[PDB]
Curated annotation (Swiss-Prot), chains C, G:
Localization (cell): Virion; Host cytoplasm
Complex formation: Interacts with capsid protein VP1 and capsid protein VP3 in the mature capsid.
The name this protein goes by in its record: Capsid protein VP2
Record organism: Human rhinovirus 14 (HRV-14)
Function noted in UniProt: Forms an icosahedral capsid of pseudo T=3 symmetry with capsid proteins VP2 and VP3. The capsid is 300 Angstroms in diameter, composed of 60 copies of each capsid protein and enclosing the viral positive strand RNA genome.
From Swiss-Prot, chain F:
Signal peptide residues on this chain, from the entry's feature table: none
Function: Forms an icosahedral capsid of pseudo T=3 symmetry with capsid proteins VP2 and VP3. The capsid is 300 Angstroms in diameter, composed of 60 copies of each capsid protein and enclosing the viral positive strand RNA genome. Capsid protein VP1 mainly forms the vertices of the capsid. Capsid protein VP1 interacts with host ICAM1 to provide virion attachment to target host cells. This attachment induces virion internalization. Tyrosine kinases are probably involved in the entry process. After binding to its receptor, the capsid undergoes conformational changes.
Name of this protein: Capsid protein VP1
Transmembrane intervals: none
Oligomeric form and interacting partners: Interacts with capsid protein VP0, and capsid protein VP3 to form heterotrimeric protomers. Five protomers subsequently associate to form pentamers which serve as building blocks for the capsid. Interacts with capsid protein VP2, capsid protein VP3 and capsid protein VP4 following cleavage of capsid protein VP0. Interacts with host ICAM1.
Compartments reported by the entry: Virion; Host cytoplasm
Length: 40, 59, 255, 59, 273, 57, 255, 40
């Protein structure tokens, strides 16, 4: 129950439960498959 | 003895046989690990569990 | 992008990667397997330690120099002291095993040299004395050290003459046994998978060795100018499908 | 770092040995990295020993 | 539910009262196996003997004390009780301890209540309301050194601020590293020859640290902190024999030497009533 | 969720542990690519490492 | 014609027969079982030597005399040196096991005496010094010898006072732990099956013992007239469902 | 009504109403019937 009118006044947000490290761990242009050779 | 780019480099000697290249314990919150991003984040938490990935790139 | 050339063998808690392989040999085209009931005789249930014995043990390294004649290891002897494999060995009456053998030797594109890596089932050695002199036990159980074919004749030991395979046959014909070459220009490792080969379903691991692994320089090592004149050779071996049976008190063997 | 809770050691040795080509010399180096597997869990947040201060900063 | 059924005379070949205790069992014998009984009902459920109930009331687990005074020229705040801490543990005060050690492994959430009362020993004037800060300092966190260190910023570490005379209350999930807390541990932290033996090695749950936020007034004020702990969501495994001798140390089973006989001697014979 | 799957001996031409770090990627290698593993579950969600939680006290 | 009284336990390559048993206790009514995946944490495949470790080891015998106070063994310590069980123990990082304990003591229908045989999960001992003196490692790792409660206090050792169970609780209440009596007039053996009890799924076998087995004379031994005044007590124990994990170099432990 | 998000913050648990002393009072391997002889 929100007792207040504005959105800033609500409690903390709830877990992204998004999670996708590939923008950080695999930003390569041509896709690399694990097990296939790195450099062909 | 002072922080240097050189403490990132593990040296290798030609022609040695049987011998040891480096050694370290695995206290990820201390020692070599401590300044790494992993080490640095682990330190915001009290407990850790899981597998670590250690890789070596040859130059 | 798979090449015959790069390979990974993971066995137990240990992994080997080679980036310069030349395929792998599987003796007699058979892969190690456990002992089937139809072939069984001893009524005892066997023990299969699995991953604690079926991992890779790297024996101490050898040094190939221009004068090297070749080295010889016996199995299961070479492993008589490796971890739990060895304990099991001394503690059961009977045991059985196959192996993956990985011999390693890297150099550069200026070196030349070529080793023969061969597995000989039942390699009965000859006494250098001739006649019917026997080869004492200790001499055929060198352990991880193996036998150094360029060492001197000793008394009660085997002959170490390479053109004769330590038994009255010519080096040239060893190629009839499962084998692989390491030619610095091609190759940097040799891998052979050995199925269990015997005339009985299971045997004693201490009174009888069932294969000798032999690494023999054939085209002499030739290093580039002003290079150090030698290369180390390393042998790593992993028991596979091991089974032990008839547990008891723990064998005591000569020397 | 805690004893009961300790994780092991990591070592590295020559398996055969480094060999340099002709006309080449000296030491070669390995770079080494660390990251966590997807396996990893961290819990119970706390304050890091990695940063402290003696007076408030100002502009 | 019947507490006793009706049962009459017996002349059988089936004797429920003869057993062999050597077996380790306690055979479930009832009044009606050996006398003639009448029906009666239980009228009772055994509600208040549930382990959740047994361990579920607040018990005092710790009393500490800190003072508000001029820190000017104090070389060791910790030592002046300018702030103090507590190496968290639940075995220091021994009423709650005997209750928990009736079990080997125990798992529960904790609810803490902290009461803080002030005392002014040296004849005084006006007491300005002091605000206590309790902050949890887990293992491997910058321990605080002065009563007003950067540590107290507590940007990542839970801390509660309440007033002396009031009470603070909050609840912490089960923070054990294993599946349960060991009430006992017959082990070491590693196989060294001189390392401590017990649980203390197992139960290093960090310490809790208290301080007054207020600067000093002209008089000195003693604030005494009492921490109460209530187990909620209790789970207990493997019952053990109750503690008979007195306790000597947090975390070891050790009892004092030349202790006194714990079994009351009869005033009379074995035959005495 | 499985934290580790069961995996046994390997003798392949497909080596997931050899990579080229010069590329800038961190290849997602797991225990089961290089030792023999058994199944285990995560039992964990990563709740307390959410940025809302990290900056939210 | 089955009696509670006669029994046979066959485990591995070893069998025990008792013709005068008093049923058998299974701690907490649970039988030893392997570690399920849902409960697993370490990702390593475990090793299950089976019949080579799950057999019966008979520890050296004790002598009950009229002055005996009782003996105490810790598990897995007591077995730290038995056959391949012990090797596995020193060689893996973690291991887990349940046991069958069979305590034996026969006499005649003229003797009297009664022993309590009890298993205590997590038996943390007390220092006889009081205060917060610790009990050194060696003292809580007596090996097959176990601890003799009628031996003298030693320094760094535990207290050996029987009315207090070596921990500040009364002998009389040990009956809350799985236990069985050996009453010469009834019984001649005691058998207890111990499931693995811990707060973690698998643990170290050397830094932590998870049960102490305790044999305590309670009704003093009384021999017939002009009989020798003593009886031997023998303890035989068999690991069951043993699993080892995290193999490596081989632990080195104090003393 | 829980006012709080985490489970630790809820009140005491509610009676097991489990109750089974046999793991403690009768951990024998072969079942003993009351009335039948203890040792056969
Ligand atoms: C056994 C056993 C069980 C316990 C209790 C463990 C409790 C976990 C840690 O306790 C706290 C205490 C205080 C705080 C706290 N946070 C802000 C203020 O106080 C947090 C966790 O201790 N030994």
């Amino acid at each position: 129950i929100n007792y207040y009118k504005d959105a800033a006044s609500t409690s903390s947000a709830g877990q992204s439960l998004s999670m996708d490290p590939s923008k950080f761990t695999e930003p390569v242009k041509d896709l690399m498959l694990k097990g296939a050779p790195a450099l062909n | 003895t002072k922080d240097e780019v050189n403490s990132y480099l593990i040296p290798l000697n030609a022609n040695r046989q049987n011998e040891q290249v480096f050694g370290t314990n695995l206290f990820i919150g201390d020692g070599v690990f401590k300044t790494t991003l992993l080490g640095e984040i682990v330190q915001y938490y009290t407990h850790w569990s899981g597998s670590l990935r250690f890789s070596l790139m040859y130059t | 992008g798979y090449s015959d050339r790069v390979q990974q063998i993971t066995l137990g808690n240990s992994t080997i990667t080679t980036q310069e392989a030349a395929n792998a040999v599987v003796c007699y085209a058979e892969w190690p397997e456990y002992l089937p009931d139809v072939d069984a005789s001893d009524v005892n249930k066997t023990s299969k330690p699995d991953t604690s014995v079926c991992r890779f043990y790297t024996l101490d390294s050898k040094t190939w120099t221009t004068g090297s004649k070749g080295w010889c290891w016996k199995l299961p002897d070479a492993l008589k002291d490796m971890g739990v494999f060895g304990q099991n060995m001394f503690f059961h009456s009977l045991g059985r095993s196959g192996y993956t053998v990985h011999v390693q030797c890297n150099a550069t594109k200026f070196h030349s040299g070529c080793l023969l890596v061969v597995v000989i089932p039942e390699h009965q050695l000859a006494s250098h004395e001739g006649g019917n002199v026997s080869v004492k036990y200790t001499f055929t159980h060198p352990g991880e050290r193996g036998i150094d074919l360029s060492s001197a004749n000793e008394v009660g030991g085997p002959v170490k003459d390479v053109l004769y395979n330590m038994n009255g046959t010519l080096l040239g014909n060893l190629l009839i046994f499962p084998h692989q070459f390491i030619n610095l220009r091609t190759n940097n490792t040799a891998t052979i998978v050995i199925p269990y080969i015997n005339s009985v379903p299971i045997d004693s691991m201490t009174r009888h060795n069932n294969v000798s692994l032999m690494v023999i320089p054939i085209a002499p090592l030739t290093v580039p100018t002003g290079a150090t004149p030698s290369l180390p050779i390393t042998v790593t071996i992993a028991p596979m499908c091991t089974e032990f049976s008839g547990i008891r008190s723990k064998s005591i063997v000569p020397q | 770092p805690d004893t009961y809770t300790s994780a092991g050691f990591l070592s590295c040795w020559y398996q055969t040995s480094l060999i340099l080509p002709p006309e080449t010399t000296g030491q070669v180096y390995l770079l080494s990295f660390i990251s966590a597997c997807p396996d990893f869990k961290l819990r119970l947040m706390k304050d890091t020993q990695t940063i402290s201060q003696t007076v408030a900063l100002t502009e | 539910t019947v507490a006793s059924i009706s049962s009459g005379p017996k002349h059988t070949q089936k004797v429920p009262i003869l057993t062999a205790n050597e077996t380790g069992a306690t055979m479930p014998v009832l009044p009606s196996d050996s006398i003639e009984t009448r029906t009666t009902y239980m009228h009772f459920n055994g509600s208040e003997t549930d382990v959740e109930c047994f361990l579920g009331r607040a018990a005092c687990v710790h009393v500490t004390e800190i003072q508000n005074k001029d820190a000017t020229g104090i070389d060791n705040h910790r030592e002046a009780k300018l702030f103090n801490d507590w190496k968290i543990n639940l075995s220091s005060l021994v009423q709650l301890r005997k209750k928990l050690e009736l079990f080997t492994y125990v798992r529960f959430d904790s609810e803490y209540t902290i009461l803080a009362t002030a005392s002014q020993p040296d004849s005084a004037n006006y007491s300005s309301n002091l605000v206590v800060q309790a902050m949890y300092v887990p293992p491997g966190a910058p321990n605080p050194k002065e009563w007003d260190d950067y540590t107290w910023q507590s940007a990542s570490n839970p801390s509660v601020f309440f007033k002396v005379g009031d009470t603070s209350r909050f609840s912490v999930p089960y923070v054990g590293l294993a599946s349960a807390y060991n009430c006992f541990y017959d082990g070491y932290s590693h196989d060294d020859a001189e390392t401590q033996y017990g649980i203390t090695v197992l139960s290093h749950m960090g310490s809790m640290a208290f301080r007054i936020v207020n600067e000093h007034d002209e008089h000195k004020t003693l604030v005494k902190i009492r921490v109460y702990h209530r187990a909620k969501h209790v789970e207990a495994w493997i019952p053990r024999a109750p503690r008979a001798l007195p306790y000597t140390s947090i975390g070891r089973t050790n009892y004092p030497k030349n202790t006194e006989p714990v079994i009351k001697k009869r005033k009379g014979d074995i035959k005495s009533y």
